[PDB]
């Protein structure tokens, strides 16, 4: 019954992996405790997607929880919902990556990495169709990024088959000060550009400007970054736990975005944009929720769509609405804005409808786009990356680890090639 | 309070806004959460003149 | 007026007929394309051939995977080398 | 002693399925646990009392099918018959002809063939799928392969679902169609393209459905393909046999493929004429398939009527229609009409959105403008084609990139066959 085995990775993978199971578990009908209370049967429909049926009724996550950082588990545990999860699912080690990629990837996350797949091969046995994988994590750090990216290579060995999906965080120096956090973000992304087949760009840029410049939060703290992650992760998976017609697996969601293998890096966006504590006076009607969805302002990775094109997009709207509405408005936006949407994919955006919406919303919208502007994403990280690279600094921490330079030399040019393929496609006209 | 807004200041570069809780009388060594005081930020960030 | 009606049957809960307007204007049978037995060992021959593609593809994937895990040993090995 | 096999594969042909045995079933007054408490010609489609439906329905992924095996109508098909897989297609054509159709091809084959151990002069397949989805246009060709090896002599009727943007799921539904159509041409006796953009817009349109549901779709497809076999349920006159489908409606192997229109559409009003329904079958906007018949030539044309309907009255209606419309026959065909009057009633689901009519028509022609369908697949197949948008998820599963070409290769050589049959002198 397409299952989806969950894994979260280091200090930001289990706290947004968390918050994913906190939001997803509430439009579900689950308590902490894994028993149902809702009054609609959609919530239970396609629950066995992301959780497992134990004895007594009860459900339980199919996720699997591994941090370095010995004291991530407290904290998980310690959580609203950490009652819920597999006790044997928590891998942990003892000595953290300490934002090192190679410690994460070569040295202590290589010493944990068989008691994970251990416990993914035993979660994935036990699925009647297993559909593929999720991975939040982020880029920036060591377990997250080297040890996620290692896990996503063994998964990959034992499953080759199987969809690979990630919910990867890119650094922002607006949100750490960490000096190497380019390193292991381009270390990361030569691994996802080769090992993934789709990847969710939540990017800490995009989200720490959308909590300061629309929120109006002075400083935003996590918890603020977080809110829109889980708001995200939400709305892009939507389709994968309720019933529907359109990118209702990760392999139908994969033939419908995915047109280049290596050009499976998504813009995240969604609306209403909300704070925690933000009370909605009224829904949004059809027209709101489809421009501000398209908006650069709620975009969760830092790049400008009209600097672009959209090979494919999937458009995803939660509530009751008029779907006559929402198709007019849907052809409205492609028709008006015909010159950011390649001429060579027709009928390139999907439209689903979901009549369950998310907590505190009447209407909400979700949007993933594949859209040859994600390249400012990457420029940017290349262009802090070649910053230190080429003053060979702090190369010592990873050599030291056994790395070999060559390896930051052959992820600089891989992302590069990514960004001159994006370009390329950019500038492909329909002949 | 006026710490923690001199802090946010001298990361986000905001000259005159340091200037501001300068003289309305901020503490100078303000800590944030990790020790360091608004001259580790502005270090940090390369903001000359708030350094100054 | 040049209608010629020829019926052709009448059953239980049905009735058919034609009706002949005018005749074709062709009198003969043109060539354009024309128009023979396809095999089951053939089809097997074109199932099996992509079976095997499809199983190469994953073979050259899982070189790939596992030349990565050749190097992760050179890292280890090369850490030990140092400390 | 003619029996009938249906098959329908994937979700569409499933669905549209269930609409068809759901009219068939009102029509021959068949309760839904297989009970008629009421001509035998209907033991060509149904085999203590019970009337088992001669289908079998064929899925990659079960949540379809077990909808049907839940359903009012559970205990109508046998288990045996309701066959579902695993894991689905995926969108992709060489997923459900190669990876995922290898699987479950020899058990499909052996629930047919148990269909057909029940049959004392079986005729043949009406087969049901869509053109878009993985299993609807993979394993439908891959079936279409074995059916001609395994029963070479009996006949192959399509229902084809035609892909339409507002109601598509899949962006690469113009790659599995020319890739289906190419793969299942030589195996096809007589294709019903069904247009979901045409049947879409006759929702909206002559119904005032605002936005039209596969529910108001199915049921308006039903009615045509009730319509169409109405001949070899009851004891008709016009098309009884599945072979006399080739023999009026088909006359090169290649074009095989004939347009319906059908009429009246009417929202569930005084009664519409032989004359008025026999003029809708000539207006493009009550056609399953989108496509201008004016602009190109008839080489077949049937009136299928059903309902109160005077032979004298079809005779006038068609009289009048050619002196006060242009409608141009290839030269090597004679410009006429195959009528036929089925005196059964049509009949509507009680609840559904079509009104019952005293009389109704179905005309089935093979024009040359259903080309015009077949153009806007193609060119949409070249845009993506041209930059390889999408063939990798074709590659990876076994496929070569040379089947594409052949296929598209194959369609232009369809189109022009459609353009030499067309040319005067
Ligand atoms: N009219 C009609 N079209 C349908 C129906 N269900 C799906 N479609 C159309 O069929 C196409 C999608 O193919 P499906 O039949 O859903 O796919 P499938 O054969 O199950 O194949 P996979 O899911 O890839 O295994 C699109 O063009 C849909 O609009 C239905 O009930 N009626
Ligand atoms: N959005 C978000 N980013 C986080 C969070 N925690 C850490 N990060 C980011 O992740 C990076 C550090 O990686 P982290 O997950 O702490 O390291 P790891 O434990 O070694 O995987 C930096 O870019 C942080 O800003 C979180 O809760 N939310
Ligand atoms: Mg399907």
Redesign the interface.
């Given at each position: 019954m397409r299952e989806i085995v969950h894994i979260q990775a280091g200090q930001c993978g289990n706290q947004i992996g968390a918050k994913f199971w906190e939001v997803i578990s509430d439009e579900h009908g689950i308590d902490p405790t894994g028993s149902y209370h809702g009054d609609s049967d959609l919530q239970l429909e396609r629950i066995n997607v992301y959780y497992n049926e134990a004895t007594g009724n009860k459900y339980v996550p199919r996720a699997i929880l591994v941090d370095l950082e010995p004291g991530t588990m407290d904290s998980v545990r310690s959580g609203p919902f950490g009652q819920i999860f597999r006790p044997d699912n928590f891998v942990f080690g003892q000595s953290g990556a300490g934002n090192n990629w190679a410690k994460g990837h070569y040295t202590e996350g290589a010493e944990l990495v068989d008691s994970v797949l251990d416990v993914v091969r035993k979660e994935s046995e036990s699925c009647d169709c297993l559909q593929g994988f999720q991975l939040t994590h982020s880029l920036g750090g060591g377990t997250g990024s080297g040890m996620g990216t290692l896990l996503i290579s063994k998964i990959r060995e034992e499953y080759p088959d199987r969809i690979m999906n990630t919910f990867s965080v890119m650094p922002s120096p607006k949100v750490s000060d960490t000096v190497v956090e380019p390193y292991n973000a381009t270390l990361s992304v030569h691994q996802l550009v080769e090992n993934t087949d789709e990847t969710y760009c939540i990017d800490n840029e995009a989200l720490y400007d959308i909590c300061f410049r629309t929120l109006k939060l002075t400083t935003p703290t996590y918890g603020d970054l977080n809110h829109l992650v889980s708001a995200t992760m939400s709305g892009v998976t939507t389709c994968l736990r309720f019933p529907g017609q359109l990118n209702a697996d990760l392999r139908k969601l994969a033939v419908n975005m995915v047109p280049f293998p290596r050009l499976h890096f998504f813009m995240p966006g969604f609306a209403p944009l909300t704070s925690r504590g933000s009370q909605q006076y009224r829904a949004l009607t059809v027209p709101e929720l489809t421009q501000q969805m398209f908006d650069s302002k709620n975009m969760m990775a830092a790049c400008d769509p009209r600097h672009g094109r959209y090979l494919t997009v999937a458009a995803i709207f939660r509530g009751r609405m008029s779907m006559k509405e929402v198709d007019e408005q849907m052809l409205n936006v492609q028709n008006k804005n015909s010159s950011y949407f390649v001429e060579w994919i027709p009928n390139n955006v999907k439209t689903a409808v979901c009549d369950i919406p998310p907590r505190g919303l009447k209407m909400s919208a979700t949007f993933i786009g594949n859209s040859t502007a994600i390249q400012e994403l990457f420029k940017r990280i290349s262009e802090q990356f070649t910053a230190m690279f080429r003053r060979k600094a702090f190369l010592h921490w990873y050599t030291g680890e056994g790395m070999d330079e060559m390896e930051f030399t052959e992820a600089e040019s891989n992302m590069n090639d990514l960004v001159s393929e994006y370009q390329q496609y950019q500038d492909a006209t329909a002949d | 309070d006026l710490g923690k807004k001199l802090l946010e200041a001298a990361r986000a570069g905001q000259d005159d806004e340091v200037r501001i809780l300068m003289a309305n009388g901020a503490d100078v060594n303000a800590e944030d959460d990790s020790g360091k005081t608004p001259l580790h930020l502005a270090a940090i960030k390369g903001h000359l003149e708030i350094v100054e | 007026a040049d209608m010629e009606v020829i019926e052709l049957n009448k059953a239980t809960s049905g009735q058919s007929w034609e009706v002949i307007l005018k005749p074709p204007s062709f009198d003969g049978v043109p060539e354009f394309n024309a128009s023979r037995d396809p095999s089951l060992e053939e089809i097997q021959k074109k199932l099996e051939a992509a079976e095997e593609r499809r199983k190469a593809h994953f073979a050259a994937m899982l070189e790939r995977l596992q030349e990565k895990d050749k190097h992760a040993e050179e890292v280890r090995k090369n850490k030990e080398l140092k400390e | 002693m003619r029996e009938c096999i249906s098959i329908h594969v994937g979700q569409a042909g499933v669905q549209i399925g269930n609409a068809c045995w759901e009219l068939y079933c009102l029509e021959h007054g068949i309760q839904p646990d297989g009970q008629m408490p009421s001509?035998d010609?209907f033991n060509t489609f149904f085999s203590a009392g019970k009337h088992v439906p001669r289908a079998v329905f064929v899925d990659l992924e079960p949540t379809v099918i077990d909808e049907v095996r839940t359903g009012t109508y559970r205990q109508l098909f046998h288990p045996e018959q309701l066959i579902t897989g695993?894991?689905?297609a995926?969108?992709?054509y060489?997923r459900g002809h190669?990876?995922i159709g290898?699987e479950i091809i020899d058990l499909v084959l052996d629930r047919i063939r148990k269909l057909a151990d029940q049959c004392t002069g079986l005729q043949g397949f009406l087969v049901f799928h869509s053109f878009g989805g993985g299993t609807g246009s993979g394993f439908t060709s891959l079936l279409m392969?074995?059916l001609?090896?395994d029963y070479?002599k009996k006949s192959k009727l399509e229902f084809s679902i035609y892909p339409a943007?507002?109601v598509?799921?899949?962006?690469?539904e113009?790659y599995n169609s020319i890739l289906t159509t190419h793969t299942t041409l030589?195996h096809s006796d007589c294709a019903f393209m069904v247009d979901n953009e045409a049947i879409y817009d006759i929702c909206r349109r002559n119904l005032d459905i605002?936005?039209p549901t596969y529910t108001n779709l199915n049921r308006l497809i039903s009615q045509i393909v009730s319509s169409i076999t109405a001949?070899l349920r009851?004891?008709?006159?016009?098309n009884?046999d599945l072979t006399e489908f080739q023999t009026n409606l088909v006359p090169?192997?290649?074009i095989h493929f004939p347009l319906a229109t059908y009429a009246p559409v009417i929202s569930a009003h005084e009664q519409l004429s032989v004359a008025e329904i026999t003029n809708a079958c000539f207006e493009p906007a009550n056609q399953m398939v989108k496509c201008d018949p004016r602009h190109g030539k008839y080489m077949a044309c049937c009136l299928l009527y059903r309902g109160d309907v005077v032979?004298k009255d079809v005779?006038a209606a068609?009289?009048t229609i050619?002196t006060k419309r242009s409608i141009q026959?290839?030269?090597?065909?004679?410009?006429?009409?195959?009528?036929?009057?089925?005196?059964?009633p049509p009949t509507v689901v009680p609840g559904g959105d079509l009104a019952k009519v005293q009389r109704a028509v179905c005309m089935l022609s093979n024009t040359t403008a259903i080309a015009e369908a077949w153009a806007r697949l193609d060119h949409?197949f070249d845009?993506?084609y041209?930059?390889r948008?999408?063939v990798?998820?074709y590659?990876?599963?076994?496929?070569?990139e040379g089947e594409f070409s052949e296929a598209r290769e194959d369609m232009a050589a369809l189109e022009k066959?459609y353009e030499?049959?067309g040319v005067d002198?």
């Amino acid at each position: 019954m397409r299952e989806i085995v969950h894994i979260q990775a280091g200090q930001c993978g289990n706290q947004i992996g968390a918050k994913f199971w906190e939001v997803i578990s509430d439009e579900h009908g689950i308590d902490p405790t894994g028993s149902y209370h809702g009054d609609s049967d959609l919530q239970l429909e396609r629950i066995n997607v992301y959780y497992n049926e134990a004895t007594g009724n009860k459900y339980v996550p199919r996720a699997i929880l591994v941090d370095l950082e010995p004291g991530t588990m407290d904290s998980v545990r310690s959580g609203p919902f950490g009652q819920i999860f597999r006790p044997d699912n928590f891998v942990f080690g003892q000595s953290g990556a300490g934002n090192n990629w190679a410690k994460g990837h070569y040295t202590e996350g290589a010493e944990l990495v068989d008691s994970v797949l251990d416990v993914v091969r035993k979660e994935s046995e036990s699925c009647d169709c297993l559909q593929g994988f999720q991975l939040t994590h982020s880029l920036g750090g060591g377990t997250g990024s080297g040890m996620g990216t290692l896990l996503i290579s063994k998964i990959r060995e034992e499953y080759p088959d199987r969809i690979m999906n990630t919910f990867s965080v890119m650094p922002s120096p607006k949100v750490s000060d960490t000096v190497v956090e380019p390193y292991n973000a381009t270390l990361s992304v030569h691994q996802l550009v080769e090992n993934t087949d789709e990847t969710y760009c939540i990017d800490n840029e995009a989200l720490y400007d959308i909590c300061f410049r629309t929120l109006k939060l002075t400083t935003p703290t996590y918890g603020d970054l977080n809110h829109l992650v889980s708001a995200t992760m939400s709305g892009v998976t939507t389709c994968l736990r309720f019933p529907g017609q359109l990118n209702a697996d990760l392999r139908k969601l994969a033939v419908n975005m995915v047109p280049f293998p290596r050009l499976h890096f998504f813009m995240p966006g969604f609306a209403p944009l909300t704070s925690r504590g933000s009370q909605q006076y009224r829904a949004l009607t059809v027209p709101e929720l489809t421009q501000q969805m398209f908006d650069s302002k709620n975009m969760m990775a830092a790049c400008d769509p009209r600097h672009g094109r959209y090979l494919t997009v999937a458009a995803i709207f939660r509530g009751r609405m008029s779907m006559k509405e929402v198709d007019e408005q849907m052809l409205n936006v492609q028709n008006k804005n015909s010159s950011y949407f390649v001429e060579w994919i027709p009928n390139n955006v999907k439209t689903a409808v979901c009549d369950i919406p998310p907590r505190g919303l009447k209407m909400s919208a979700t949007f993933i786009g594949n859209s040859t502007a994600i390249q400012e994403l990457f420029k940017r990280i290349s262009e802090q990356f070649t910053a230190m690279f080429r003053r060979k600094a702090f190369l010592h921490w990873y050599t030291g680890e056994g790395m070999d330079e060559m390896e930051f030399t052959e992820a600089e040019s891989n992302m590069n090639d990514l960004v001159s393929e994006y370009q390329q496609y950019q500038d492909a006209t329909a002949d | 309070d006026l710490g923690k807004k001199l802090l946010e200041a001298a990361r986000a570069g905001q000259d005159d806004e340091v200037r501001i809780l300068m003289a309305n009388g901020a503490d100078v060594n303000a800590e944030d959460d990790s020790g360091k005081t608004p001259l580790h930020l502005a270090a940090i960030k390369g903001h000359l003149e708030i350094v100054e | 007026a040049d209608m010629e009606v020829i019926e052709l049957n009448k059953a239980t809960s049905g009735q058919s007929w034609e009706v002949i307007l005018k005749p074709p204007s062709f009198d003969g049978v043109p060539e354009f394309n024309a128009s023979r037995d396809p095999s089951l060992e053939e089809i097997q021959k074109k199932l099996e051939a992509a079976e095997e593609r499809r199983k190469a593809h994953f073979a050259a994937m899982l070189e790939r995977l596992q030349e990565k895990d050749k190097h992760a040993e050179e890292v280890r090995k090369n850490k030990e080398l140092k400390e | 002693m003619r029996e009938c096999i249906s098959i329908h594969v994937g979700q569409a042909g499933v669905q549209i399925g269930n609409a068809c045995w759901e009219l068939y079933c009102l029509e021959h007054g068949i309760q839904p646990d297989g009970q008629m408490p009421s001509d035998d010609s209907f033991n060509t489609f149904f085999s203590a009392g019970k009337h088992v439906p001669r289908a079998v329905f064929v899925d990659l992924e079960p949540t379809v099918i077990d909808e049907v095996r839940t359903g009012t109508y559970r205990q109508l098909f046998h288990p045996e018959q309701l066959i579902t897989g695993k894991e689905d297609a995926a969108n992709n054509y060489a997923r459900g002809h190669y990876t995922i159709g290898k699987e479950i091809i020899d058990l499909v084959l052996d629930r047919i063939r148990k269909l057909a151990d029940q049959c004392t002069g079986l005729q043949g397949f009406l087969v049901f799928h869509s053109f878009g989805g993985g299993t609807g246009s993979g394993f439908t060709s891959l079936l279409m392969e074995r059916l001609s090896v395994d029963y070479g002599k009996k006949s192959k009727l399509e229902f084809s679902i035609y892909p339409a943007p507002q109601v598509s799921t899949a962006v690469v539904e113009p790659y599995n169609s020319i890739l289906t159509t190419h793969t299942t041409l030589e195996h096809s006796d007589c294709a019903f393209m069904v247009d979901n953009e045409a049947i879409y817009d006759i929702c909206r349109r002559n119904l005032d459905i605002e936005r039209p549901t596969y529910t108001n779709l199915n049921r308006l497809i039903s009615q045509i393909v009730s319509s169409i076999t109405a001949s070899l349920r009851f004891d008709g006159a016009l098309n009884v046999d599945l072979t006399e489908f080739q023999t009026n409606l088909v006359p090169y192997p290649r074009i095989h493929f004939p347009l319906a229109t059908y009429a009246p559409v009417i929202s569930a009003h005084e009664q519409l004429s032989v004359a008025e329904i026999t003029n809708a079958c000539f207006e493009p906007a009550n056609q399953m398939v989108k496509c201008d018949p004016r602009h190109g030539k008839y080489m077949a044309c049937c009136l299928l009527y059903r309902g109160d309907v005077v032979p004298k009255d079809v005779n006038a209606a068609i009289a009048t229609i050619k002196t006060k419309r242009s409608i141009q026959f290839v030269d090597w065909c004679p410009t006429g009409f195959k009528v036929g009057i089925n005196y059964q009633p049509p009949t509507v689901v009680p609840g559904g959105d079509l009104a019952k009519v005293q009389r109704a028509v179905c005309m089935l022609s093979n024009t040359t403008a259903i080309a015009e369908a077949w153009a806007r697949l193609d060119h949409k197949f070249d845009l993506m084609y041209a930059k390889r948008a999408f063939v990798h998820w074709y590659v990876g599963e076994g496929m070569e990139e040379g089947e594409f070409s052949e296929a598209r290769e194959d369609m232009a050589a369809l189109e022009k066959d459609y353009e030499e049959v067309g040319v005067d002198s």
